[PDB]
């Protein structure tokens, strides 16, 4: 609240300093921000505690940055950490005390939890509460009465209005409890699903699962883990532990196929007990319990087949022990979020690898599913070797003079097709691909503009893939990329980042970018995180290049796009010039070639 002569807020008169400050490695700002030391001997203990009570926002190598909020404190109380159980240790760890504001915030957040519990039974959602005064003073607003369908006091609530009531309670200071007591539940018989000994659970996976299962009752929340880290394995383990009917929701056909494959590989459950509620292929969804479908499958708003109506009505009628939702970052979308209310589930676990978006709808996920349970430390995984180390880089390509002339001259938005296609970046990517090709490194080129992708691919006579590409040709190209030594590069369009199971690649070049999309950046980066059989963290075998054009809007998009990665800790090194480019022969070495490309770009319209 107090501002120094500079931008920073002043806290000299706010909180004191502990005498044994050097012993205490923890800081506590009044706003809730906490700065932990990664060099302290008790760093691991501090990390566990701060991860339990707070969500990371920046975890560089030296000083980690956490911030706590109501949802994080609720998650701590869910794993059973009382207000004293957290605040006492926070004061002990803190080297400068705990401001009264944070003290009262912690007390209020912890006490305002568990008073209101939401439990669904016999397809009816009852708002139970041991304390009656909470309901007595909670029925002030008319929205509660109109929402409601027309000790331990409970009342049934309308299915459709659950989301609205949930978001209302969040700001009403009475969060709802979505814990599932699968251990004590006889209404829905347990499913015959077991985890085979073959599956191996990594320490971070076990920690995330423990945080989800803080007690005997499973907690509904979001666990953010890298795509290469085995989030599919974690989800399968969660379903197996729940031992009740599970409905996994993908985002595309490849996602549903991979989820079925993961279920069979890691769970002893029989093949016949798994169904694919997909229009292209139906495996008798009503016959068995464990189901895999997608958000468009359930939330579809327009006409439905008669068979799909029967399946949908069966799904609505039945109650699900677990509702796994992969790629939760798309949930707050209108149609996708309608699925949450369409289907009934005790705990709706959420898995993803890039929980970031521009529109401030990510906060809605906290109430749509639950608080962010776990968020794996990418740097720690890199050190442990679970994830391949990446030498993140941004190759700056100077724009050609004529291209810049038209780019600046026109105030329209042909620049997206212009600066994405310039001779300098073309030569840069050509040289980079040549260097890695002679180095036997697998290349996965990326480009949002299909026009630029096709032009680059034809000029380099490479197998470019994109949306309307036939499925058979897609599979043939991927198989050749994985097996044929003669080919070691594939030029994938935006479809690549959506969802796929692609072979591990040693480099990932990105000539163009869709825009300032942290989601797309992280999604594409996750491709090369696939750990090799015997690599090492320090070898930096994996590389990521995000080619950008200097003095262009692409620079703004790149800088705005690398925020999530730098927050994780990756250091994007800038490369002004590439050694050996002048000696190596490359296309567009003469003005005429650039002129023809420019004429084609102008004629693109």
């Amino acid at each position: 609240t107090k501002v120094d002569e500079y931008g920073a807020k002043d806290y000299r008169l706010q909180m004191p300093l502990k005498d044994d400050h050097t012993s205490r490695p923890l800081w506590v700002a009044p706003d809730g921000h906490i700065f932990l030391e990664a060099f302290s001997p008790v760093y691991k203990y501090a990390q566990d505690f701060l991860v339990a009570i707070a969500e990371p926002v920046c975890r560089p190598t030296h000083v980690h940055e956490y911030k706590l909020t109501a949802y994080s404190l609720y998650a701590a109380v869910s794993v059973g950490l009382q207000t004293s159980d957290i605040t006492e240790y926070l004061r002990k760890l803190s080297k400068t005390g705990v401001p009264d504001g944070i003290m009262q915030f912690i007390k209020l957040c912890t006490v305002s939890y568990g008073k209101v519990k939401l439990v669904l039974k016999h397809n009816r959602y009852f708002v139970e509460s041991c304390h009656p005064d909470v309901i007595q003073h909670l029925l002030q607003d008319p929205v509660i009465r109109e929402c409601r369908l027309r000790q331990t006091v409970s009342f049934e609530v309308k299915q459709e209005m659950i989301e609205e009531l949930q978001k209302r309670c969040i700001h009403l200071e009475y969060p709802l409890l979505a814990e599932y007591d699968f251990r004590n539940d006889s209404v829905n018989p347990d499913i015959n699903i077991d985890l085979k000994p073959t599956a191996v659970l990594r320490p971070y996976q076990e920690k995330s699962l423990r945080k989800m299962f803080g007690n005997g009752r499973a907690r509904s929340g979001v666990i953010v883990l890298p795509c290469g880290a085995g989030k599919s394995l974690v989800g399968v383990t969660a379903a197996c532990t729940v031992r009740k009917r599970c409905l996994v929701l993908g985002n595309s056909a490849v996602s549903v196929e991979q989820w079925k494959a993961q279920f069979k590989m890691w769970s002893t459950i029989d093949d016949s007990q798994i169904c694919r509620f997909t229009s292209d292929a139906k495996d008798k969804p009503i016959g068995c319990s464990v189901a895999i479908s997608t958000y468009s499958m359930l939330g579809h708003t327009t006409k439905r087949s008669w068979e799909a109506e029967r399946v949908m009505e069966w799904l609505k009628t039945q109650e699900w022990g677990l509702m796994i939702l992969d790629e939760v970052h798309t949930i707050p979308a209108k149609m996708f979020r309608r699925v949450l209310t369409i289907v009934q589930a005790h705990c709706k676990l959420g898995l993803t690898a890039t929980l970031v978006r521009e529109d401030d709808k990510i906060v809605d996920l906290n109430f749509l599913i639950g608080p962010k349970l776990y968020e794996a430390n990418w740097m720690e995984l890199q050190n442990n070797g679970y994830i391949a180390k990446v030498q993140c880089a941004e190759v700056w390509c100077p724009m050609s003079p004529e291209f810049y002339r038209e780019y600046v001259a026109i105030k329209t938005k042909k620049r997206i097709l212009l600066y994405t296609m310039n001779p300098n970046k073309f030569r840069a990517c050509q040289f980079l691909i040549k260097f890695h090709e002679r180095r036997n490194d697998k290349i996965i080129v990326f480009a949002d503009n299909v026009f630029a992708l096709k032009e680059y691919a034809i000029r380099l006579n490479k197998p470019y893939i994109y949306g309307p590409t036939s499925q058979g040709e897609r599979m043939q190209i991927l198989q050749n990329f994985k097996h044929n030594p003669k080919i070691n590069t594939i030029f994938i369009s935006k479809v690549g980042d959506t969802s796929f199971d692609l072979p591990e690649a040693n480099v990932l070049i990105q000539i163009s970018s869709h825009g300032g999309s942290r989601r797309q950046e992280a999604q594409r980066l996750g491709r090369v995180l696939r750990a090799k059989k015997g690599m090492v963290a320090e070898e930096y075998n994996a590389f990521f290049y995000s080619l950008v054009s200097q003095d262009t809007q692409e620079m703004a998009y790149s800088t705005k796009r690398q925020r999530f990665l730098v927050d994780q800790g990756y250091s994007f090194k800038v490369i002004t010039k590439l050694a050996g480019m002048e000696e190596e022969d490359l296309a567009f070495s003469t003005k005429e070639e650039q002129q023809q490309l420019l004429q084609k770009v102008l004629a693109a319209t």
Binding site: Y89, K92, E206, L209, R210, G216
Partner: peptide, 18 residues
């Protein structure tokens, strides 16, 4: 037959005392 996760949170910091 329950799993280790159902037991409870590890509470890794509880070991340290001052």
């Amino acid at each position: 037959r329950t799993k280790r996760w159902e037991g409870g949170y590890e509470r890794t910091w509880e070991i340290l005392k001052e």
